Design a protein around this ligand. Structure first.
Ligand SMILES: Nc1ncnc2c1ncn2[C@@H]1O[C@H](COP(=O)(O)OP(=O)(O)O)[C@@H](O)[C@H]1O
Ligand SMILES: Nc1ncnc2c1ncn2[C@@H]1O[C@H](COP(=O)(O)OP(=O)(O)O)[C@@H](O)[C@H]1O
Lengths: 513, 513
């Protein structure tokens, strides 16, 4: 009997990937293609939508070709899931099927002025005014503000609106449009919760905000769950349709951070995950009911398996410099050269012995939202070494997540039961130990590291009946994909010293303007 | 007649040199011999005074013997000058002519408890209570608290005192006693100003202070100028009378920092010198009347040519971590490897792009005495690099000296005229330019950088008629020895911003206890 496979498009900030999974939840074929990171003005970032689409189809046709060399009795993929960098917004025309301009990216800062024009003229000052509707504060990140900026500052967008041709879309929507030939204009609830145009509880567009923010709802896609029929792959860009060999349904769509939650099996309330990439995104599943935030955290959709399946919600927090800190220490400061020296140097000392290092190189986020904070070290003596500084960096990442989790527990009214961790810094043993001690929960480290791409494939597979239930999903995961477990081992008194010391350091970090 | 030669004994903390200078102020023969650093308990440091005496003597014989080989016009040394690590205190017996113990060194900390007692019981809790007599605060450095400690803790010393055979003396006193056979029990004004027993205004021992501190005046040597006949070399230790050949008078004695003030030609009020060593010692000639400091700067005697000749007073400030910071950056943090790269990396960026590095590794000194301050860096971004950090360390050193100078100008009622520089860290071209720019004066860098030894040689040679006036000395320097002049090359707008950022940074440095 023949292996069924499920494809996952992982459309990230810096690259695109197609991972083909089998029924074991094993990546059996992968391919990656990068796209250009345009930076026209300092603080701006922008992607070519056609470069992304092409990257995605190039990825698919290559991975398929490789899989069929290792399984010549293959023939088709059961379904395809999409997961994506969120918030990043693309505008296109619906007759040409072509982008009107380059897509500003989640962390672009051009929408700043509009951030403020909005908060004042609509919010009556309160940045969290619309938050009980959307889940989100007003920031540069969210899609609506980028939709707005384009409408205001892009000739071809301004026009295309008046002509009744304008389509807006997060990357999922863009992928699904172009992948289906123009046939589907859709989004999923996770991506939709990032627009600042969607009512969290109801998971439908808010006409208040659309007409309030100057956004014609004719320019907005239909919302669905993460797990159902969205469309079929109709295009043929890089022989993609021919390589699929049968008409293939797109049955999965889910934002990248939620995809990692789902992919690490964080299905029940209290279960949470952290992705240590360049930064950190921590997400906690908080149950079937939406929770909102006294400490400036985000409230968002975790996932919804099926049209009127239950919708799980989550809280979300972030640190801006995690992996970037470690890389900064080698590339900027020459504190080590090979990647494994970081943990090696940090273990070589017993502690930080007085120093604290707050790696707030582009501000504190999270529950102490402070853009004036900069990178800071205190307590050095002539005994301090690069080893102490590196250890101190790792403690500091952990200490930020500690404060984030503290916040989520009070805003959610639950305990964190366990913490799943993925990303480059997932592989730093000492960091996961310090992390476990501070939170006082186990940190599970998946050795099938591809968990973001897995999330989308699970949504796709659940909808195509490759997996029948979440328990079948969890069970296959346990048979097939191992994990290291990192238990806490601190002591109430040490933790308190570390946090007290940390709390004093934070007061000395304010610096810019 | 023939070529004249003056010799200089430079008795430092870690070694002793003998430099022979010719009439052009050229060092023509040099030898160096170390002496043992005994540390009985942490924070304690002690020198073997007989080892010091022998080193000086070996230094002399070797330097002279080398010079006879390399210079057929060298007949004898016209006179010898002495310069010394100040404060270090020797106790010895006037009949055995030997020490009663090792000599606690200037940076020795065993006098800490005696220091707290003196403040509380003699000064009502004011450390500055005697500072209008001595120009000094109560501190572990000064000679009187070391005497006091030897009586209270050394049975032999207390014994010798009981028997009327006790001689206390700073290193100048000890060297002139031993070099003369035991016939001279003298000290120059500059070293005496470092005892906490001398009255700045009279340049005599202060009966009140000796009585209040219970150092019998009988134990102290006679106070003389820096330049006059102290006596004659008579010992034949290490063949030194053999090497000198003829009768050689000792005609110069002056404390090391002051010697550098003198050797740098700072003969007028408003002329200052800075030594850029492990730390920095900055002195300014304040003119013929003492100036007391409303900023914790120390008031001291600059110099005095001739028994009851005009006496030039000085203000003194220190920084603890100068070249030590350069060294920490290399040895502890791996920011560069060869010392040339320090200046190269700092040159490679136009400024510090807003970071400040306060290297208060061992507290803050200068006019912000704060032993709780620790090493700190603020303001970093992911654009910051080691080049920025190295350059900030250099800026930090110049900013401290800018604050010290500023304090001096307010205490003295005068402008800084120019700054002569020496020490290893004055080979750093960029540190010199930053310093000209911040201070708005020319920085003169002697090519003949042996300024400390030259002070003593000048005192001696003036007294011997090798040079007949301060103006002849200045001319000879100019005609014979290269001075490099470093003019300001900054803007007053940058200066201002650098200073404002320095001030903000200093507020963030408090950490210890
Ligand atoms: N236990 C299994 N049952 C069925 N097919 C398998 C099994 N293990 C591997 N495969 C198949 O072999 C091909 C390559 O898979 P891969 O995991 O790279 O194999 P390996 O485990 O030898 O590295 C895929 O088609 C995959 O589905
Ligand atoms: N050529 C050079 N360039 C830059 N820095 C130097 C150079 N040579 C020595 N240094 C640094 O300057 C300091 C020189 O100190 P030094 O003058 O030797 O000690 P002291 O404090 O006893 O005068 C050292 O700490 C060293 O790091």
């Amino acid at each position: 009997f023949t292996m069924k496979y499920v494809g996952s498009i992982d459309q990230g900030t810096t690259s695109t990937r197609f991972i083909i999974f089998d029924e074991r939840q094993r990546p059996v074929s992968v391919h990656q293609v990068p796209h250009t990171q345009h930076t026209p003005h300092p603080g701006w970032l922008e992607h070519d939508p056609m470069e992304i689409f092409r990257s995605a189809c190039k990825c698919m046709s290559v991975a398929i070709a490789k899989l069929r060399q290792k399984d010549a009795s293959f023939r088709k993929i059961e379904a395809i899931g999409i997961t994506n960098q969120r918030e990043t917004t693309v505008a296109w025309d619906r007759v040409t099927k072509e982008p009107l301009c380059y897509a500003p990216v989640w962390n672009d800062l051009r929408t700043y002025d509009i951030t403020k024009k909005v908060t004042a003229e609509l919010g009556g000052g309160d940045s969290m005014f619309a938050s009980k509707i959307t889940g989100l504060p007003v920031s540069t990140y969210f899609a609506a503000f980028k939709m707005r900026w384009m409408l205001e500052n892009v000739p071809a967008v301004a026009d295309a609106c008046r002509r009744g041709t304008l389509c807006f879309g997060t990357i999922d929507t863009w992928l699904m449009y172009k992948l289906s030939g123009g046939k589907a204009f859709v989004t999923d609830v996770t991506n939709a919760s990032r627009t600042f145009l969607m009512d969290l509880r109801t998971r439908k567009w808010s006409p208040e905000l659309c007409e309030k923010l100057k956004i014609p709802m004719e320019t907005l896609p239909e919302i669905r769950s993460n797990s159902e029929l969205f469309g079929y792959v109709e295009t043929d860009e890089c022989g993609v349709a021919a390589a699929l060999n049968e008409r293939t349904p797109i049955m999965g769509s889910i934002g990248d951070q939620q995809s990692a939650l789902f992919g690490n099996m964080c299905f029940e309330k209290g279960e949470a995950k952290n992705t240590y990439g360049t930064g950190c995104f921590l997400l906690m599943n908080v149950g079937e009911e939406a929770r909102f935030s006294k400490h400036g955290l985000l409230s968002t959709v975790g996932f919804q398996v099926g049209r009127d399946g239950p919708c799980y919600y989550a809280l979300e927090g972030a640190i801006a410099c995690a992996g970037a800190t470690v890389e900064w220490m080698r590339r900027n400061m020459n504190l080590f050269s090979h990647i494994t020296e970081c943990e090696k140097l940090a273990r070589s000392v017993p502690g930080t012995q007085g120093i604290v290092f707050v790696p707030a190189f582009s501000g504190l986020l999270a529950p102490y939202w402070d853009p004036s904070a900069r990178g800071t070290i205190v307590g050095m003596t002539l005994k301090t070494t690069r080893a102490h500084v590196i250890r101190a960096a790792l403690q500091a990442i952990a200490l930020q997540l500690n404060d984030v989790v503290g916040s989520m527990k009070r805003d959610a009214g639950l305990n964190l039961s366990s913490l799943r961790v993925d990303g480059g810094l997932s592989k730093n043993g000492l960091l996961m130990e310090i992390q476990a001690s501070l939170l006082g929960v186990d940190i599970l480290v998946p050795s099938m590291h591809e968990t973001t791409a897995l999330g989308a494939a699970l949504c796709a597979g659940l909808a195509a009946g490759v997996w029948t239930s979440l328990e079948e999903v969890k069970a296959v995961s346990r048979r097939e994909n191992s994990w290291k477990t990192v238990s806490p081992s601190g002591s109430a008194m040490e933790r308190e010293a570390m946090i007290a010391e940390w709390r004093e350091a934070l007061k000395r970090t304010k610096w810019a303007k």
